[PDB]
Amino acid sequence: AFIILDEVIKVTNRRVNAIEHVIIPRTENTIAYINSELDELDREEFYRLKK
Amino acid sequence: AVEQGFNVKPRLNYNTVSGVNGPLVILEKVKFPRYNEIVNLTLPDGTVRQGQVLEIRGDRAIVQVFEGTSGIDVKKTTVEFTGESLRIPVSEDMLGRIFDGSGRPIDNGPKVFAEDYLDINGSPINPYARIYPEEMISTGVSAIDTMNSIARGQKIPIFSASGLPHNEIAAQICRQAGLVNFSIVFAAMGVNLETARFFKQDFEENGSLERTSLFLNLANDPTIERIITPRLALTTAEYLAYQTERHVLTILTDMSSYADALREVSAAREEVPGRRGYPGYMYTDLSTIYERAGRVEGRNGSITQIPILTMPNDDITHPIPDLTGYITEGQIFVDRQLHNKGIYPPINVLPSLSRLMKSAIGEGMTRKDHGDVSNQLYAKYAIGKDAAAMKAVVGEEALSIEDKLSLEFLEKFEKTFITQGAYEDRTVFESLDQAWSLLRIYPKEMLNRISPKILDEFY
Amino acid sequence: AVEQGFNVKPRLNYNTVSGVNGPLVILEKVKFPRYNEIVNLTLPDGTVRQGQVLEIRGDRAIVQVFEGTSGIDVKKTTVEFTGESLRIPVSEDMLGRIFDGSGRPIDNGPKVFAEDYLDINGSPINPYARIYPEEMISTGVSAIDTMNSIARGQKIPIFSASGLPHNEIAAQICRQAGLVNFSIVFAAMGVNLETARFFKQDFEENGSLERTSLFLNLANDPTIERIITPRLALTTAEYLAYQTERHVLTILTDMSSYADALREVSAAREEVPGRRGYPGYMYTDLSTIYERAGRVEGRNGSITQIPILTMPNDDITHPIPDLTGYITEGQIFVDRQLHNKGIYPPINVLPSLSRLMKSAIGEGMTRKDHGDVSNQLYAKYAIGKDAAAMKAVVGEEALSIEDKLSLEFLEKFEKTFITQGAYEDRTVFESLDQAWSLLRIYPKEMLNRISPKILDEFY
Amino acid sequence: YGAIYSVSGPVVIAENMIGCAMYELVKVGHDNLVGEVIRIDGDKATIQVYEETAGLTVGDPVLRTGKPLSVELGPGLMETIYDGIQRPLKAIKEESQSIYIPRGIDTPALDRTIKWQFTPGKFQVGDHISGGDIYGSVFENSLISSHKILLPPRSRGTITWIAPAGEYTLDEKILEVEFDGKKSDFTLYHTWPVRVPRPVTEKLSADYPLLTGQRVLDALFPCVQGGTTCIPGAFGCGKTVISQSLSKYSNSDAIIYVGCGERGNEMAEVLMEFPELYTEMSGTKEPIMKRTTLVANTSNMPVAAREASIYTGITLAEYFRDQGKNVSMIADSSSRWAEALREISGRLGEMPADQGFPAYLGAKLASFYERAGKAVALGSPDRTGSVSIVAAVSPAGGDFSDPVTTATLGITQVFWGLDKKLAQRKHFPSINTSVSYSKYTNVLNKFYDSNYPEFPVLRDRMKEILSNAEELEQVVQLVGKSALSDSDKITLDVATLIKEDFLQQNGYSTYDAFCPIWKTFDMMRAFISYHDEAQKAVANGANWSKLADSTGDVKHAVSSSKFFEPSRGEKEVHGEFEKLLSTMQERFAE
Ligand SMILES: Nc1ncnc2c1ncn2[C@@H]1O[C@H](COP(=O)(O)OP(=O)(O)O)[C@@H](O)[C@H]1O
Ligand SMILES: [Mg+2]
């Protein structure tokens, strides 16, 4: 039971560290890039309407 | 007082109509076109249509006639200028009547017998004369009246999605609102006709109409009338509260519909749209509409506000929710998950808060345990949500005692406390008693946010 | 008796040119200008370029020059008004001919001996005079013949991207697009010489030059003729299919390039733009092009459009693929991810769709199991993609037995069923048998989408 | 008699036209192309031509008709196909004898050669008649056995002469109304502007439900006879299939299938499929095309016709409501109506507001949707009609943030949101259960208590089960489904079964094309009873794995409940589900 719990805890801690360090910066950067891209599209539409 | 009204002002009838573009009617050779002047066009078929001028030039006015321009002819269309912007005949007897988007009564009763003609735009309240909201308005909604308190004179909006029963919650609040005199002023803009008749029969058959000046604006009703409606409700509220010394608690419905109406009014004047198509000055317009509420030092009345929004795509980053959150203090959220899980009201307390709650939940007003009970309930609801998420992760057995009890509290909270009948009225004291009844499943040591004296006296 | 009239109509030579903005030539003193009228711009050099009138004022007539405005002056440029819209000389002899983007032959042959002149814009085919396409085209591609069926009279584009083998897939369909022979009208709009030579070689090897017509508007050709090419090709296809009772398989390529030509013309006209600067009427123009395909009552011919659309950034939300998928009757989706994996044809079956599959894949037309097998393959491929995502994110050991079986199904579906290679020629029945071999991995209990009778009969 | 001064595409600008009115139909060109004046900038008058402007020169005559866009309401429109305006496509094909539509053809919207049987109503000569009153009953079809000849609204007076019972055409006068001195004459048909809502005495609250047939709709997100619904979703997703399902199998007594911005082959499929299907609403089974009208406007027709077809369909539905028939109009591609509006606004030059759409998009959509609702038609005798507006929306890119989607979502009461992910997996009807909603459940509690008392409780239970299972599935995706609770696994399995055998039905399969209200209620009760039995048995102590192994037969029976054929009638189908409950209860003992 101790060995199985050690393996499970190692896998879970690796999963938490992976989730945070990889995914959360990755998804946050994707959100920022998407917001920037739609902001650029809105700015282009605004410029066309101003013209 | 109002004695200069005994003056007959002749009205100029301009046959000259230069152009008719979209919803606008462009006149020509006008004498002295006042901005925002109300205009009564006379179609060749004989129908009369109200209008409001949008852009002014040298002997040229652009009239934005209501009900569209279908039938407007250049050759034969008399245009009558009323040398005054839109004004409503306010009275103390308009409590108990239903008015249209343009202020015309749509009741079986007569036109309201005026006491004064107030400009719908109104004047800004002097900040030196403004007063911090102090007392509570008791609402039948136990979730609101306990966890997100409404103080007399604040602006607390309700954020909802399209399908959530925000209109039903509005009707419930209008029916059960009261002091813990009162006179609700209800304004619905861009509302579906089924919801409008629902408001009609609800207020007529529950006795709430003797205290409500209902302002219904249909979706098919004119969009400029949709613009005018919240101004009408706030002007009536200003009259009642400040020139009558009573509390109002206006409930504006479909601020999203009002924002769309503002969009159409702005784009009709050849103006570029702002961020999400909405006009850039939407912040200023919403600020006027909202900050038209509040308490004053000289008068004993108050104007509370519950502008009920409809968040498109359930996005808080949407301009209308963002600007409303900026201008107003606090917010009440209606949750799609809660609506799917159960029944009225689908209000979740985790994202919903009231900024001036501490003033409403005091010692002399309501009960001295209100703040502690509400904070404890919020904390234990958060812990219950965490435990509900954690059960499927770590198994039900492995949860601690403080997590199993918190899950039981969450069940009895989303199923008995928040869950309220659409017609049942819960006073603030009864709601606090029920909150204690839920909180008594814990050991006296578990309740940490509550003060020891309150725990000893109430638990 | 066919009635054709001899008549000579003199044409005014307007020397007055008052603007050569971009690809648009603006005349000044036109007498009774005619909208959508062909004009000939005799350049000072001597060469004449066709033009089309896009807008007429009281005296102005804005003309878009198909061959470009390079070299156009004001003093010595004379515009000759032909007085009629563009009418391509159509004949049954056009089969085997290679034409330019403007309909002028480039196959070192004579001008087509006209049997009739037909308006390029055509007319809307009467919805009451249409026939629902029910005969299924047994394209050799398994990913199409199964799970997205093509009928005679369908408008099913190929949504691809830059570098993907859309040309190869369309050429494969053209080689093997028999029933369960097809004349081909191939329209090239701004494709490169590599693609044009590939298609010409593709047709010559398969013997299609005996019954094909090509309208090659290469990338070197002027960009405005990309507007005129698809209309020419489709009116030729309409002539053949209806007035000759042939079975035309129209293959438009670079509809994205056609839409870019529209944007270039729309931007020059300074019209109010839609999404990404594309004209607000691009939906109407694309619909006019696409909806010229289908079966007609009484006539024994049909048009089967397969417009090769290349999505600019592999994003189906782009206006061109969005409107094309909204207008047409389906789409064949070519996946960059599958191409990177090395699967040919890289047809991503999930985004792909055939709205006529429901009527063309019934009993009698094909085997009784076609619809059930297609639905089951779709469901299991979606489950496979979800299981692949789960394996990528969560650990592989956490995947269930069903998840592992579905991963194996995805592997053998992509690497054995979709992978076909050119010249393979899978019959519909053979493709269905291979699909059943794929579905025999699962126990009969797991196959939910298969009806019990078909499951008993074929498993 | 004006003259074109500019064309610039579909929007001609005719000059020297004084006295014009907005939305007045002028006859542009020598071919008498119809139009609609939409800007009067002095002498000039911008006109949106409903036909293909190609050849119109500067100097061609434009003449003002003297009437807004009016449909020819009356007997003769119950199986015909109409263009964006109101032009019989069958008559056009039979007259021009061409596969195309001739440019500027002038064919009457109603067939004036058909002799219609007429039978006068209770009104007699000398009686005072009011607008909307009934003064006849024309036998049109087997299904439409009495087409009431309504007196036109806004036209009243004293009846001076009425025609006796006999066979009359659509041009023979039938009624002479004295009115205020001027003796008008009323024939069988009567025109009415399409942008002016037809008058009603008083609208009511729609109570009886519109049985869509689809289990997801009719169970979780019901609609009422008179409600406004939307089905937004990207291309695909089954918007058109749901529309045709409600067109074929519905409780409505009449239907107007508007097809603005729709493929021609969609209308061809409707015309080929509808005559095959039959309904027993009348005494005997009769074809669908005897109660279905198609305002078919293909996507290649001018955008002005796309704009006009929505109003033409809604006013036809309003007419059949005024007759007292429960109509359910099904608009197709309301987003394409909005796209036509956007194109027209762009050609005019008006400033777009939201994502290129015009600013008045919300106002136009509200004006169109508000025409719905149960209402008592004005005039005697009293009779109740309904116009259910089942309009399909196709947002660009499949995002529900589109301006047309947002406006329609705010205006309507029901929302059958579709998901591209479910559509591509062929999980039709592909209803996005999380986002979809219905505001008519509160009203429908009364009908449910009358007919199927347990229906609201079962629907709420299934919604709660689906939401709980969605949360549990999110947690499973997060945490690898490690040591999931037995009850949690039960809810996950039950919800997967519900999604795969109750919310997934092939609308084209013979057995699941139409799931009636009784069959879907029995299936709901069977699913809920299975879930409750599993919950109770596991709470007793039974392991879920062994329980599933033992009750796989019952689970397969509940799955095959979707394969149960509704054609056997209520008596046979209800008895079959009675055995399923008995079998499910039997497994509880074991
Ligand atoms: N309820 C359903 N049953 C069976 N097939 C369906 C169903 N709904 C949609 N489909 C399939 O989806 C395909 C296209 O759907 P359709 O309704 O044409 O999309 P759109 O709404 O974009 O027109 C059709 O070929 C049809 O087979
Ligand atoms: Mg469709």
mmCIF file of N, CA and C in Angstrom, chain C residues 32-35 55-58 123-129 131-133 153 155 272 281 283-284 287 291 296 299 316 323 325-329 331 350 355 358 378 382 449 452, chain D residues 5-9 53 55-58 89-90 92-93 99-101 233-236 261 263 265 269 299-301 303 306 336 343 346-347 352 394-395 397 424-426 508 563:
data_model
loop_
_atom_site.group_PDB
_atom_site.id
_atom_site.type_symbol
_atom_site.label_atom_id
_atom_site.label_comp_id
_atom_site.label_asym_id
_atom_site.label_seq_id
_atom_site.Cartn_x
_atom_site.Cartn_y
_atom_site.Cartn_z
ATOM 1 N N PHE C 32 -27.108 57.984 -72.200
ATOM 2 C CA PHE C 32 -27.933 56.880 -71.722
ATOM 3 C C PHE C 32 -27.080 55.658 -71.401
ATOM 4 N N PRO C 33 -26.235 55.716 -70.374
ATOM 5 C CA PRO C 33 -25.426 54.545 -70.026
ATOM 6 C C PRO C 33 -26.302 53.385 -69.587
ATOM 7 N N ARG C 34 -25.833 52.176 -69.871
ATOM 8 C CA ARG C 34 -26.573 50.958 -69.577
ATOM 9 C C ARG C 34 -25.815 50.147 -68.536
ATOM 10 N N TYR C 35 -26.505 49.768 -67.464
ATOM 11 C CA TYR C 35 -25.866 49.022 -66.388
ATOM 12 C C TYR C 35 -25.518 47.609 -66.840
ATOM 13 N N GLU C 55 -21.544 50.930 -62.297
ATOM 14 C CA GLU C 55 -22.394 51.963 -61.724
ATOM 15 C C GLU C 55 -22.519 53.091 -62.731
ATOM 16 N N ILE C 56 -23.717 53.655 -62.833
ATOM 17 C CA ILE C 56 -23.991 54.741 -63.763
ATOM 18 C C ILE C 56 -24.642 55.884 -63.000
ATOM 19 N N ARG C 57 -24.093 57.081 -63.153
ATOM 20 C CA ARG C 57 -24.746 58.295 -62.695
ATOM 21 C C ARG C 57 -25.550 58.871 -63.857
ATOM 22 N N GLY C 58 -25.976 60.127 -63.735
ATOM 23 C CA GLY C 58 -26.705 60.753 -64.827
ATOM 24 C C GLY C 58 -25.921 60.764 -66.124
ATOM 25 N N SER C 123 -29.945 33.341 -65.320
ATOM 26 C CA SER C 123 -31.160 33.666 -64.599
ATOM 27 C C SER C 123 -31.364 32.668 -63.471
ATOM 28 N N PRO C 124 -31.996 33.089 -62.380
ATOM 29 C CA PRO C 124 -32.311 32.141 -61.302
ATOM 30 C C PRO C 124 -33.183 31.006 -61.816
ATOM 31 N N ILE C 125 -32.702 29.776 -61.639
ATOM 32 C CA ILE C 125 -33.483 28.613 -62.036
ATOM 33 C C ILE C 125 -34.698 28.502 -61.129
ATOM 34 N N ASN C 126 -35.856 28.259 -61.727
ATOM 35 C CA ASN C 126 -37.105 28.196 -60.985
ATOM 36 C C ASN C 126 -37.041 27.087 -59.941
ATOM 37 N N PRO C 127 -37.253 27.389 -58.658
ATOM 38 C CA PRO C 127 -37.257 26.318 -57.648
ATOM 39 C C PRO C 127 -38.295 25.245 -57.912
ATOM 40 N N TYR C 128 -39.432 25.601 -58.512
ATOM 41 C CA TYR C 128 -40.416 24.594 -58.887
ATOM 42 C C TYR C 128 -39.948 23.738 -60.054
ATOM 43 N N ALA C 129 -39.044 24.249 -60.886
ATOM 44 C CA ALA C 129 -38.531 23.508 -62.028
ATOM 45 C C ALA C 129 -37.290 22.695 -61.697
ATOM 46 N N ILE C 131 -35.082 19.633 -59.687
ATOM 47 C CA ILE C 131 -35.240 18.254 -59.246
ATOM 48 C C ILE C 131 -34.247 18.007 -58.123
ATOM 49 N N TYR C 132 -34.702 17.353 -57.066
ATOM 50 C CA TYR C 132 -33.815 17.019 -55.964
ATOM 51 C C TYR C 132 -32.810 15.971 -56.422
ATOM 52 N N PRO C 133 -31.507 16.242 -56.346
ATOM 53 C CA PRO C 133 -30.507 15.268 -56.812
ATOM 54 C C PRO C 133 -30.481 14.043 -55.913
ATOM 55 N N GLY C 153 -25.849 16.926 -59.508
ATOM 56 C CA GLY C 153 -26.595 18.123 -59.197
ATOM 57 C C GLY C 153 -26.223 18.773 -57.887
ATOM 58 N N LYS C 155 -23.553 20.833 -55.219
ATOM 59 C CA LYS C 155 -22.515 21.856 -55.165
ATOM 60 C C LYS C 155 -21.717 21.588 -53.892
ATOM 61 N N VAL C 272 -18.998 50.114 -48.918
ATOM 62 C CA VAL C 272 -18.959 49.761 -47.501
ATOM 63 C C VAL C 272 -18.581 48.289 -47.389
ATOM 64 N N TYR C 281 -21.885 42.273 -50.439
ATOM 65 C CA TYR C 281 -22.656 41.445 -51.354
ATOM 66 C C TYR C 281 -21.885 40.216 -51.814
ATOM 67 N N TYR C 283 -21.718 37.421 -50.335
ATOM 68 C CA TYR C 283 -22.626 36.291 -50.175
ATOM 69 C C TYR C 283 -23.511 36.136 -51.402
ATOM 70 N N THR C 284 -24.053 37.247 -51.905
ATOM 71 C CA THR C 284 -24.923 37.183 -53.074
ATOM 72 C C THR C 284 -24.153 36.762 -54.320
ATOM 73 N N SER C 287 -23.340 33.094 -54.007
ATOM 74 C CA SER C 287 -24.561 32.323 -54.194
ATOM 75 C C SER C 287 -24.969 32.279 -55.658
ATOM 76 N N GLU C 291 -25.189 28.508 -57.003
ATOM 77 C CA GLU C 291 -26.537 28.008 -57.245
ATOM 78 C C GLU C 291 -26.841 27.775 -58.714
ATOM 79 N N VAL C 296 -32.678 19.764 -63.431
ATOM 80 C CA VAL C 296 -33.818 20.576 -63.834
ATOM 81 C C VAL C 296 -34.889 19.664 -64.417
ATOM 82 N N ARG C 299 -35.312 18.427 -68.470
ATOM 83 C CA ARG C 299 -33.963 18.201 -68.969
ATOM 84 C C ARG C 299 -33.370 16.935 -68.363
ATOM 85 N N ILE C 316 -11.922 27.888 -41.041
ATOM 86 C CA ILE C 316 -13.237 27.807 -41.664
ATOM 87 C C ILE C 316 -14.118 28.994 -41.308
ATOM 88 N N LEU C 323 -19.265 31.645 -46.001
ATOM 89 C CA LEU C 323 -20.348 31.853 -46.953
ATOM 90 C C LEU C 323 -20.439 30.713 -47.955
ATOM 91 N N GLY C 325 -19.733 27.508 -47.406
ATOM 92 C CA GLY C 325 -20.400 26.405 -46.742
ATOM 93 C C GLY C 325 -21.855 26.693 -46.439
ATOM 94 N N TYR C 326 -22.206 27.970 -46.270
ATOM 95 C CA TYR C 326 -23.603 28.312 -46.031
ATOM 96 C C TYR C 326 -24.419 28.232 -47.315
ATOM 97 N N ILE C 327 -23.798 28.528 -48.456
ATOM 98 C CA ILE C 327 -24.515 28.504 -49.728
ATOM 99 C C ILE C 327 -24.571 27.093 -50.292
ATOM 100 N N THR C 328 -23.419 26.436 -50.384
ATOM 101 C CA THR C 328 -23.328 25.140 -51.030
ATOM 102 C C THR C 328 -24.041 24.071 -50.207
ATOM 103 N N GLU C 329 -24.030 22.849 -50.739
ATOM 104 C CA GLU C 329 -24.753 21.723 -50.163
ATOM 105 C C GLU C 329 -23.830 20.774 -49.410
ATOM 106 N N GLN C 331 -19.428 20.267 -47.888
ATOM 107 C CA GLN C 331 -18.035 20.633 -48.088
ATOM 108 C C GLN C 331 -17.165 19.409 -47.860
ATOM 109 N N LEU C 350 -14.917 14.682 -40.301
ATOM 110 C CA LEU C 350 -15.816 15.341 -39.354
ATOM 111 C C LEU C 350 -16.311 16.693 -39.855
ATOM 112 N N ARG C 355 -25.108 17.277 -47.652
ATOM 113 C CA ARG C 355 -26.511 17.382 -47.273
ATOM 114 C C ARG C 355 -27.388 16.444 -48.090
ATOM 115 N N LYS C 358 -28.244 11.988 -47.250
ATOM 116 C CA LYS C 358 -29.412 11.366 -46.638
ATOM 117 C C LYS C 358 -30.327 10.748 -47.688
ATOM 118 N N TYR C 378 -18.713 7.897 -38.051
ATOM 119 C CA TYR C 378 -18.574 9.265 -37.567
ATOM 120 C C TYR C 378 -18.507 9.304 -36.046
ATOM 121 N N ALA C 382 -15.205 10.444 -33.867
ATOM 122 C CA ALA C 382 -15.252 11.512 -32.874
ATOM 123 C C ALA C 382 -14.792 11.012 -31.510
ATOM 124 N N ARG C 449 -25.023 3.236 -32.916
ATOM 125 C CA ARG C 449 -25.615 3.928 -34.057
ATOM 126 C C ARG C 449 -26.156 2.958 -35.099
ATOM 127 N N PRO C 452 -30.488 -2.512 -35.079
ATOM 128 C CA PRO C 452 -30.317 -3.943 -34.774
ATOM 129 C C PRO C 452 -30.442 -4.855 -35.983
ATOM 130 N N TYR D 5 -31.891 57.796 -62.591
ATOM 131 C CA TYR D 5 -30.718 58.649 -62.615
ATOM 132 C C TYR D 5 -29.450 57.905 -62.235
ATOM 133 N N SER D 6 -29.570 56.793 -61.514
ATOM 134 C CA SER D 6 -28.430 55.968 -61.150
ATOM 135 C C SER D 6 -28.919 54.550 -60.911
ATOM 136 N N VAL D 7 -28.015 53.586 -61.082
ATOM 137 C CA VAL D 7 -28.350 52.185 -60.845
ATOM 138 C C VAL D 7 -27.421 51.607 -59.787
ATOM 139 N N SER D 8 -26.122 51.555 -60.089
ATOM 140 C CA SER D 8 -25.095 51.150 -59.123
ATOM 141 C C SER D 8 -25.403 49.801 -58.476
ATOM 142 N N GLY D 9 -26.105 48.932 -59.195
ATOM 143 C CA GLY D 9 -26.432 47.622 -58.688
ATOM 144 C C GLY D 9 -27.918 47.428 -58.473
ATOM 145 N N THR D 53 -31.337 43.859 -61.809
ATOM 146 C CA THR D 53 -31.044 45.075 -62.564
ATOM 147 C C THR D 53 -29.841 44.804 -63.455
ATOM 148 N N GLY D 55 -29.257 46.098 -67.421
ATOM 149 C CA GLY D 55 -29.749 46.653 -68.663
ATOM 150 C C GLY D 55 -30.506 47.947 -68.469
ATOM 151 N N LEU D 56 -30.864 48.252 -67.224
ATOM 152 C CA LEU D 56 -31.560 49.497 -66.932
ATOM 153 C C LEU D 56 -30.662 50.680 -67.251
ATOM 154 N N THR D 57 -31.126 51.545 -68.144
ATOM 155 C CA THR D 57 -30.367 52.703 -68.582
ATOM 156 C C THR D 57 -30.885 53.963 -67.904
ATOM 157 N N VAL D 58 -30.073 55.017 -67.966
ATOM 158 C CA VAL D 58 -30.420 56.307 -67.377
ATOM 159 C C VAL D 58 -31.406 56.984 -68.323
ATOM 160 N N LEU D 89 -44.584 30.366 -58.408
ATOM 161 C CA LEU D 89 -43.535 29.768 -59.225
ATOM 162 C C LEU D 89 -44.108 28.752 -60.202
ATOM 163 N N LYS D 90 -45.108 27.981 -59.768
ATOM 164 C CA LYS D 90 -45.757 27.040 -60.673
ATOM 165 C C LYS D 90 -46.426 27.764 -61.832
ATOM 166 N N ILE D 92 -45.600 30.714 -62.984
ATOM 167 C CA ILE D 92 -44.536 31.274 -63.813
ATOM 168 C C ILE D 92 -43.981 30.215 -64.755
ATOM 169 N N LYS D 93 -43.732 29.012 -64.236
ATOM 170 C CA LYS D 93 -43.218 27.938 -65.080
ATOM 171 C C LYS D 93 -44.238 27.527 -66.135
ATOM 172 N N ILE D 99 -37.289 27.123 -67.723
ATOM 173 C CA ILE D 99 -36.742 26.632 -66.467
ATOM 174 C C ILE D 99 -36.243 27.768 -65.589
ATOM 175 N N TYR D 100 -36.025 28.948 -66.160
ATOM 176 C CA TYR D 100 -35.620 30.113 -65.394
ATOM 177 C C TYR D 100 -36.851 30.926 -65.004
ATOM 178 N N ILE D 101 -36.625 32.022 -64.286
ATOM 179 C CA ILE D 101 -37.682 32.962 -63.929
ATOM 180 C C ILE D 101 -37.568 34.159 -64.870
ATOM 181 N N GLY D 233 -27.178 28.128 -35.264
ATOM 182 C CA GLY D 233 -26.086 27.187 -35.400
ATOM 183 C C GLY D 233 -25.400 27.390 -36.732
ATOM 184 N N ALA D 234 -24.161 26.912 -36.798
ATOM 185 C CA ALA D 234 -23.382 27.026 -38.019
ATOM 186 C C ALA D 234 -24.007 26.180 -39.128
ATOM 187 N N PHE D 235 -23.422 26.273 -40.322
ATOM 188 C CA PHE D 235 -23.894 25.463 -41.437
ATOM 189 C C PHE D 235 -23.786 23.987 -41.085
ATOM 190 N N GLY D 236 -24.848 23.244 -41.371
ATOM 191 C CA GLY D 236 -25.014 21.927 -40.796
ATOM 192 C C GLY D 236 -25.854 22.029 -39.541
ATOM 193 N N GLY D 261 -32.934 33.201 -48.281
ATOM 194 C CA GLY D 261 -31.520 32.860 -48.231
ATOM 195 C C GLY D 261 -31.261 31.378 -48.084
ATOM 196 N N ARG D 263 -30.965 27.377 -50.072
ATOM 197 C CA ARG D 263 -30.632 26.717 -51.325
ATOM 198 C C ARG D 263 -31.898 26.315 -52.070
ATOM 199 N N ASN D 265 -32.256 23.680 -53.822
ATOM 200 C CA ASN D 265 -32.488 22.254 -53.633
ATOM 201 C C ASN D 265 -33.198 21.965 -52.318
ATOM 202 N N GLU D 269 -36.398 19.703 -52.332
ATOM 203 C CA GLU D 269 -36.588 18.565 -51.443
ATOM 204 C C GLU D 269 -37.906 18.668 -50.693
ATOM 205 N N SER D 299 -31.273 31.526 -52.596
ATOM 206 C CA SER D 299 -30.228 32.444 -52.168
ATOM 207 C C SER D 299 -29.715 33.327 -53.298
ATOM 208 N N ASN D 300 -29.901 32.929 -54.558
ATOM 209 C CA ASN D 300 -29.407 33.741 -55.662
ATOM 210 C C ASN D 300 -30.384 34.829 -56.091
ATOM 211 N N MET D 301 -31.618 34.812 -55.588
ATOM 212 C CA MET D 301 -32.548 35.896 -55.851
ATOM 213 C C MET D 301 -32.091 37.166 -55.133
ATOM 214 N N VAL D 303 -31.406 40.419 -52.860
ATOM 215 C CA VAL D 303 -31.492 40.567 -51.409
ATOM 216 C C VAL D 303 -32.777 41.270 -50.996
ATOM 217 N N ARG D 306 -35.173 38.634 -50.515
ATOM 218 C CA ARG D 306 -34.894 37.964 -49.247
ATOM 219 C C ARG D 306 -35.515 38.725 -48.086
ATOM 220 N N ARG D 336 -29.793 35.019 -42.761
ATOM 221 C CA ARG D 336 -29.684 35.463 -44.148
ATOM 222 C C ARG D 336 -30.638 36.598 -44.481
ATOM 223 N N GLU D 343 -26.492 43.913 -46.558
ATOM 224 C CA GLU D 343 -26.082 44.258 -47.915
ATOM 225 C C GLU D 343 -26.818 45.495 -48.412
ATOM 226 N N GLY D 346 -25.373 48.503 -46.709
ATOM 227 C CA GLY D 346 -24.076 48.833 -47.275
ATOM 228 C C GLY D 346 -24.184 49.522 -48.621
ATOM 229 N N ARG D 347 -25.087 49.041 -49.478
ATOM 230 C CA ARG D 347 -25.290 49.694 -50.768
ATOM 231 C C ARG D 347 -25.845 51.102 -50.591
ATOM 232 N N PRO D 352 -22.832 50.863 -40.631
ATOM 233 C CA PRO D 352 -23.103 49.637 -39.878
ATOM 234 C C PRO D 352 -22.813 49.839 -38.402
ATOM 235 N N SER D 394 -28.391 31.390 -38.585
ATOM 236 C CA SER D 394 -27.108 30.805 -38.976
ATOM 237 C C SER D 394 -26.015 31.836 -38.754
ATOM 238 N N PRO D 395 -25.522 31.954 -37.522
ATOM 239 C CA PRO D 395 -24.465 32.930 -37.243
ATOM 240 C C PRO D 395 -23.181 32.593 -37.982
ATOM 241 N N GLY D 397 -19.581 31.739 -38.659
ATOM 242 C CA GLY D 397 -18.528 31.087 -37.909
ATOM 243 C C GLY D 397 -18.988 30.219 -36.761
ATOM 244 N N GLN D 424 -21.039 17.364 -35.913
ATOM 245 C CA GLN D 424 -20.028 16.641 -36.676
ATOM 246 C C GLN D 424 -19.923 15.187 -36.241
ATOM 247 N N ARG D 425 -20.188 14.899 -34.967
ATOM 248 C CA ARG D 425 -20.257 13.520 -34.505
ATOM 249 C C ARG D 425 -21.564 12.842 -34.883
ATOM 250 N N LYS D 426 -22.387 13.486 -35.713
ATOM 251 C CA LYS D 426 -23.703 12.980 -36.104
ATOM 252 C C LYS D 426 -24.580 12.686 -34.892
ATOM 253 N N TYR D 508 -34.739 11.046 -40.064
ATOM 254 C CA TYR D 508 -35.057 10.417 -41.337
ATOM 255 C C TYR D 508 -35.357 8.931 -41.203
ATOM 256 N N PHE D 563 -36.242 2.481 -30.438
ATOM 257 C CA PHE D 563 -36.597 1.750 -31.647
ATOM 258 C C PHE D 563 -38.065 1.360 -31.686
#
